[PDB]
């Protein structure tokens, strides 16, 4: 996959301003509130019943961060994501058999979350870099399939 010197800035630049804590809680909380199907996989966490509770429960408010922080690992190397999420791609496919369209449903949820914490500080041309990222992510985690 191709990346550039301008997409490297929109990405590496904005990464170092993400309050991972909250947005990783925000977007896992949303996934769980947005597509309610997405709740089955997270049975082990407890109370996910009322949309507002979903955020109050602090396993998501914890496990959420591990998603965004996850995305951390990538940013260090846009040029070996393949080998990065690969060990991680075994974890979502073999063990907890997760349908990758959902790898599109948090990527899309997680761009929306940046979207509300960076206002016009979130460039049309930016967002794009950030899809390409969580698009490249999405399908890395789906290496251990076809």
């Amino acid at each position: 996959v191709h990346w550039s010197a301008e997409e490297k800035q929109l990405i590496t630049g904005l990464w170092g301003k993400v309050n991972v804590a909250e947005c990783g809680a925000e977007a896992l909380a949303r996934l769980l509130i947005v597509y309610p199907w997405t709740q089955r996989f997270f049975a082990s966490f407890g109370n996910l019943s009322s949309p507002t509770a979903i955020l109050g429960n602090p396993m998501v408010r914890a496990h959420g961060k591990k998603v965004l922080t996850s995305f951390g690992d990538a940013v260090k190397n846009l040029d070996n994501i393949k080998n990065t999420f690969s060990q991680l791609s075994e974890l979502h496919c073999d063990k907890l058999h997760v349908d990758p369209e959902n790898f599109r449903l948090l990527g899309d949820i997680l761009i929306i979350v940046l979207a509300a914490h960076f206002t016009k500080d979130f460039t049309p041309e930016c967002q794009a870099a950030w899809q390409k990222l969580v698009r490249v992510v999405a399908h890395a985690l789906a290496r251990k399939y076809h």
């Binding site: 949303r30 509130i33 899309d108 761009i111 929306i112 979207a115 509300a116 914490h117 049309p124």
Partner: protein, 141 residues
Amino acid sequence: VLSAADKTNVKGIFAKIAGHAEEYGAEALDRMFTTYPQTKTYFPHFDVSHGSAQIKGHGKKVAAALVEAANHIDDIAGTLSKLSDLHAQKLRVDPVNFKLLGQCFLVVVAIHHPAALTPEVHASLDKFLCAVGTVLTAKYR
């Protein structure tokens, strides 16, 4: 498909978005070309450059009917079918882009009302967008 709690959330976000449709629609659209250059094929006699005349005169209508669908929701499936042809029969849009516009429309709202588009309101619209999603692709299902 779209119950009471939804109706209230959906109507809400709207009279919020309302009096800035001439730029909440242009933005959205200005974002679906710049993240998604493939949707550009539907626009090859369009001015695609940033901020142009044809996009803002357009986008205006993408909400102009996006909110006419909002304030008559008890029957989205009827008020929009007019286009559900232009979309389903005339231009024939791949349904996999109502999304790519579904979203780039929630990258606008988000930017300008990040404290209104709570998850639940985010849900209703994204399900109302799944409403204006299906009806506009009527000719297949």
